[PDB]
Design a protein around this motif. Structure first.
Motif, short mmCIF file in Angstrom:
data_model
loop_
_atom_site.label_atom_id
_atom_site.label_comp_id
_atom_site.label_asym_id
_atom_site.label_seq_id
_atom_site.Cartn_x
_atom_site.Cartn_y
_atom_site.Cartn_z
N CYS D 49 0.83 -1.19 0.00
CA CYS D 49 0.00 0.00 0.00
C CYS D 49 0.87 1.25 0.00
CB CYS D 49 -0.93 0.00 1.22
SG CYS D 49 -2.06 1.42 1.31
N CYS D 52 0.14 3.23 3.51
CA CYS D 52 0.41 2.54 4.76
C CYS D 52 1.56 1.56 4.53
CB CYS D 52 -0.86 1.86 5.29
SG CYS D 52 -1.92 1.13 4.01
N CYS D 60 -3.64 -3.37 7.07
CA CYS D 60 -4.05 -2.19 6.32
C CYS D 60 -5.56 -2.22 6.12
CB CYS D 60 -3.33 -2.11 4.98
SG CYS D 60 -3.73 -0.64 4.00
N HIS D 63 -8.93 2.18 2.57
CA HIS D 63 -8.92 3.62 2.38
C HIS D 63 -10.02 4.04 1.41
CE1 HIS D 63 -4.78 2.64 3.73
NE2 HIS D 63 -4.89 3.79 4.39
#
Ligand code: MG
Ligand code: MG
Ligand code: ZN
Ligand code: ZN
Lengths: 57, 76, 109, 384, 174, 113, 56, 97
Positions: D49, D52, D60, D63
């Motif tokens: 990611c 992150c 994670c 988002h």
DNA sequence: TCTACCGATAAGCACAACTACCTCTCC
RNA sequence: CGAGAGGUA
DNA sequence: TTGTGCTTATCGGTAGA
């Protein structure tokens, strides 16, 4: 009638989308007073174990 | 005041569980141990000998609370 | 029988496949019976600890959801708390945000 | 990188607005040809990611990203309130006037929302009351005056409809023109959420939460504002909470109400009068693989441990009985005292009992003090 | 700006040592001692070394997390706020071509840029660089006072780094 | 409210209590002790009661804020033109004459032998 | 890649059959056999609706 | 053939009765707003400690057990049906006009 | 003399019709 | 990953 | 295939000023 809002329990009962939409439109506030609401968010129900606190000191 | 002066089954079970968890974490026992190796037995002995230093705070519906003690309450 | 096994891709729960590892469903009736008995530690473990344990960060100055955690509503804040909620709660919050509902979370501690 | 731990309480509910949507989205992309599946999707075919750290879809989260439009559109949830408000207030007087006096020959008009009946668009359509129109026809008035619809400003978004001169559809821009001049106090009473009226952005679900074709269709910049609202309404109804298998109440039951746990076993049960009433016979083949957590880290199941037995369906609280584990030389089967079949309401003809093994010490301590067999000697239904 | 401002804490205590009720304060003081020792950092407060006066202690709340009990205790301690407009002294540690090192104790590292002192020229004819153009010799160990500037901080270490300027009067050692 | 003196005295108590029962079952930190040893050797005073009273005396009879009095005690200026050039907040004022300020500096130099 | 047996897959290989259709798609079939001795929890039935599991 | 009715009745009764508990004051309270339902539990035999028990949950479980055991009885509108009679008794608000 | 809300009755539309499992067989 | 048919308690 | 609600809506249907 009792003036106790509970959108989460009502949504879990039946028709969750309509209850959530009504709660969002009304801007109500849920205090998670019910046992099922506490269980759905990782909290004790408060009936048998949870209504007292064990303080060491 | 305004209390039944009795320790309920739920409170007793919670106290026993907390004491067993503390004992399992290498905690000294106030009561003398003789031929006992299980934490539950030691917790039961301490509860029966009313020498466990725990305090119970009972919450009332109105918002107030009352603080008690293990030695103050009686068992059955 | 199951001790450790794969989780479902959608929700972090054991799969209902006996061939791989298996999984026992803890239904509503068992939860109601356990509530009637009064065992709260067992019920907390069956729904949050061994079922799905996740974390969520909530800002304290405002009432939002932060993704270390950062809050873009305000400046970089040093007061952000972490709450322990099941992954189902996070999934429901994401669904509500997608359908057009924003939730405000308040933390006592 | 440490944060404190606090409890959660007093969950609030509110309708999303532009400020929260534009402040919660991280690296929002509105490019029609770019999916941007590198900062918000976990199962994307990429290394790690970009917002992150590297993980295995376990550290994670998902988002969010919100696309940006070029103008403002009224929230579809408030369309009913706007239609109700426009019905009361005359559209040419801005009060509670040719449209107010019956002697001017102008029939009363009504504002309502049409659903898939005319143009498959959930918009606001003005319809002339047919009862008033019939009265005008008896007076020799066959057609409405040409200046009847002079109160509607000209809009470029209007297109070829040709429905009828009596029924006209209101574009999103024209609604704001009608709202202009109305007192703020009256508008606030009808619509509480005055800030959330402007919907200029729409969030897109992350790939981790899994709906994509419609999202890619609405990101393209184009006219025909009457279609954008329909697209938004259509893509909003694809949520799992809306009813149509995992949808609506079934989604709630399968996610939040009913959950699956670890450290569980399910086998067929037979009879064994040699065992005690509070003891359950667990085979050595299965108990050896079942692991428990004990403070000294996972030891095998042995004698003295308590398991929570249950038989579906759990029609009463006595179906949950805590019994002590006893190892038997048998395999692939569990055994218990035949007298204990009454609380389970089960026979021995293929009935299967699934049990639960507690891991924390406190759960074990509270299991044999409240849910044990010796604690359930009195039936709570009748006292016998 | 070294005002003794009280600050409460929520230090937790492991269940490994929970006994000796007549002398349980020894476990309490050692628990708070390791509380701020593990952190040993701050963002805008400063630093603390010793818990001089313990104001008041609260009821110990427990949690079902590996047998840990918290202790809400409030007390006052010594700190230091680097407010703008203060003349603070410092001791030089080394010298280089850029970023002259200045240490006001090991709690922070202060760097001096080129556009901070008056017009001077580097002297490469010796081992340590000198700035005796304005009739002032600076070496390691001499205390030099300067005006403190705005302090910065990091994410992990969160060091109290700032800028040193000799634009004020009474420059150099005294 | 410790500038140089009482901050040094409390450190002496730490040293006095450190020699007794130095063995600790828990962990220790050497950074904090280094920060105290290598910072307290900048400026020291002679006596605690007399110095504090003479520092707080102008704080009572004259109007100086807590922040301004703290920064002038750490700097310890020895003239009138030095203080007027350090603190920009003391520029363009007539609340206090410079002659009493000169007498205050003499008292500060008198207590420091 | 290769196909592996699951947790509850066992037996002895009996025969391997290879076949293909007109499209050229090849097929492979492997048969595993095992003798199922009557276990302690096996279910048995009668000719008059008498169904029950083995007990001992 | 007829088993969904007992399950639906049990679920709808549990959703009503799961939030009822007895407080330390001796009164039977509710989880939502501490609503007072009964001032005193009946307790024909009052030698008990029910200051923290879930009375509504066990009452709902007992009624569910009664409803499920009625499946053995003939579920008939023409002759008799104890389960249908119990369902009609438990459903009073729906029967209006 | 001419409406303004109020009432009875189709009407069209929704949500809902039990739990915990095991299998095959297209996608 | 779902969908369709059978079966067990 | 019904069982309840829920909202239009659709005609009268009374007073009523
Ligand atoms: Mg039978
Ligand atoms: Mg059977
Ligand atoms: Zn914030
Ligand atoms: Zn990410």
């Amino acid at each position: 009638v009792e003036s106790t809002p509970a959108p989460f329990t009502q949504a879990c009962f039946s028709s969750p989308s309509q209850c959530f939409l009504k709660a969002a439109k009304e801007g109500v506030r849920d205090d998670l007073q019910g046992s099922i609401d506490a269980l759905a968010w990782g909290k004790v129900p408060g009936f048998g174990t949870g209504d007292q606190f064990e303080i060491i000191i | 005041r305004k209390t039944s002066k009795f320790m309920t089954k739920y409170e007793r079970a919670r106290i026993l569980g907390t004491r067993a968890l503390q004992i399992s974490m290498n905690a000294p026992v106030m009561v003398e141990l003789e031929g006992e190796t299980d934490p539950l037995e030691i917790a039961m002995k301490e509860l029966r000998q009313r020498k466990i230093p725990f305090t119970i705070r009972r919450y009332l519906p109105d918002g107030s609370f009352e603080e008690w003690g293990v030695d103050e309450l009686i068992v059955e | 029988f199951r001790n450790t096994g794969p989780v479902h891709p959608l929700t972090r729960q054991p799969v209902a496949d006996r061939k791989r590892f298996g999984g026992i469903k803890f239904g509503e009736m068992e939860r109601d019976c356990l509530i009637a008995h009064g065992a709260s530690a067992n019920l907390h473990e069956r729904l949050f600890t061994l079922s799905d344990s996740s974390q969520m960060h909530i800002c304290r100055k405002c009432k939002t959801y932060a993704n270390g955690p950062y809050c873009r509503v305000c400046v970089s804040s040093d007061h952000v708390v972490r709450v322990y909620v099941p992954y189902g709660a996070k999934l429901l919050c994401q669904e509500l945000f997608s359908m057009g509902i924003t939730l405000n979370f308040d933390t006592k501690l | 990188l440490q944060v404190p731990v606090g409890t959660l309480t007093s969950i609030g509910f509110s309708i999303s607005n532009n400020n929260d949507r534009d402040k919660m989205s991280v690296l929002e992309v509105e490019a029609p040809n770019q999916v941007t599946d590198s900062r918000l999707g976990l199962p994307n075919p990429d290394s790690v990611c970009r917002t992150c750290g590297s993980k295995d879809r376990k550290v994670c989260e998902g988002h969010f990203g919100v696309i940006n439009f070029a103008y403002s559109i009224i929230n579809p949830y408030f369309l009913k309130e706007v239609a109700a408000l426009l019905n009361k207030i005359c559209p040419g007087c801005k009060y509670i006037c040719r449209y107010c006096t019956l002697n001017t020959g102008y029939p009363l008009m009504k504002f309502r929302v049409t659903t898939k009946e005319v143009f498959r668009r959930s918009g606001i359509v003005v319809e002339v009351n047919e009862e008033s129109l019939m009265k005008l026809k008896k007076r020799g008035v066959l057609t409405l005056p040409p200046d009847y619809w002079s109160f509607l400003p000209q809009d470029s978004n209007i297109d070829e409809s040709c429905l009828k001169p009596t029924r006209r559809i209101i574009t999103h821009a024209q609604v704001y023109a009608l709202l202009l001049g109305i007192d703020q106090r009256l508008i606030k009473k009808d619509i509480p959420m005055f800030n959330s009226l402007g919907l200029t952005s729409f969030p897109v679900t992350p790939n981790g939460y899994r709906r994509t074709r419609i999202y890619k269709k609405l990101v393209g910049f184009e006219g025909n504002t009457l279609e954008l609202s329909s697209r938004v309404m259509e893509c909003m109804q694809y949520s799992r909470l809306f009813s149509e298998k995992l949808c609506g109440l079934r989604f709630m039951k399968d996610v939040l109400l009913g959950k699956r746990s670890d450290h569980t076993f399910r086998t067929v049960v037979v009879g064994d009068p040699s065992l005690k009433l509070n003891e359950i016979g667990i085979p050595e083949s299965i108990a050896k693989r079942l692991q428990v957590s004990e403070h000294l880290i996972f030891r095998s199941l042995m004698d003295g441990d308590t398991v929570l037995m249950n038989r579906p369906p759990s029609i009463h609280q006595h179906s949950l009985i805590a019994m002590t584990v006893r190892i038997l030389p048998t395999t692939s089967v569990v055994s218990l005292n035949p007298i204990c079949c009454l609380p389970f309401r089960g026979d021995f003809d293929g009935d299967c009992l699934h049990g639960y093994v507690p891991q924390s010490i406190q759960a074990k301590v509270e299991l044999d003090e409240l849910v044990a067999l010796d604690k359930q000697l009195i039936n709570r239904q009748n006292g016998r | 700006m070294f005002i003794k401002v009280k600050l409460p804490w929520d230090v937790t205590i492991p269940a490994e040592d929970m006994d000796t009720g007549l002398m349980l304060q020894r476990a309490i003081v050692i628990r708070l001692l390791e509380a701020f020792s593990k952190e040993k950092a701050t963002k805008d407060l400063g630093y603390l070394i010793t818990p001089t006066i313990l104001e008041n202690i609260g009821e110990g709340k427990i949690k079902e997390q590996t047998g840990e009990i918290q202790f809400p205790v409030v007390f006052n301690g010594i700190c230091f706020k680097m407010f703008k407009g203060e003349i603070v002294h410092g001791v030089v540690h080394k010298v280089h071509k850029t970023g002259v090192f200045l240490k006001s104790g090991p709690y922070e590292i202060i760097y001096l840029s080129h556009m901070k002192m008056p017009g001077y020229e580097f002297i490469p004819g010796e081992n340590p660089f000198f700035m005796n153009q304005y009739m002032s010799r600076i070496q390691i160990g001499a205390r030099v006072r300067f005006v403190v500037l705005d302090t910065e901080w990091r994410e992990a270490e969160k060091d109290f780094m700032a800028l040193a300027s000799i634009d004020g009067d009474n420059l150099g050692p005294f | 409210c410790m500038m140089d003196c009482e901050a040094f005295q409390i450190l002496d108590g730490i040293k006095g209590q450190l020699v007794g029962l130095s063995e600790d079952p828990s962990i220790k930190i050497p950074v904090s002790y280094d920060r105290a040893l290598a910072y307290v050797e900048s400026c020291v005073h002679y006596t605690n009661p007399q110095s504090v009273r003479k520092v707080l005396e102008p704080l009572k009879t004259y109007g100086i804020s807590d922040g301004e009095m703290c920064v002038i005690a750490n700097a310890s200026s020895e003239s009138v033109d030095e203080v007027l050039a350090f603190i920009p907040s003391l520029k363009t004022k007539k609340e206090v004459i410079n002659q009493p300020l000169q007498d205050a500096l003499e008292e500060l130099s008198k207590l420091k032998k | 890649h290769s196909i592996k047996l699951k947790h509850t897959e066992r037996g002895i290989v009996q025969k391997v059959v290879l076949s293909s259709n007109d499209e050229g798609k090849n097929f492979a079939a492997v048969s595993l056999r095992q003798v199922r001795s009557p276990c302690l929890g096996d279910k048995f039935s009668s000719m008059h609706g008498q169904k029950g599991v083995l007990g001992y | 053939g007829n088993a969904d009715l007992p399950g639906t009745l049990s679920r709808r009764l549990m959703f009503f009765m799961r939030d009822i508990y007895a407080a330390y004051d001796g009164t039977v309270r509710n989880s939502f707003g501490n609503q007072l339902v009964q001032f005193t539990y009946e307790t024909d035999g009052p030698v008990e400690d029910i200051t923290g028990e879930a009375l509504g949950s066990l009452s709902a479980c007992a009624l569910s057990e009664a409803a499920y055991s009625a499946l053995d009885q003939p579920i008939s509108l023409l002759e008799t049906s104890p389960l249908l009679n119990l369902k009609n008794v438990l459903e009073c608000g729906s029967k209006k006009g």
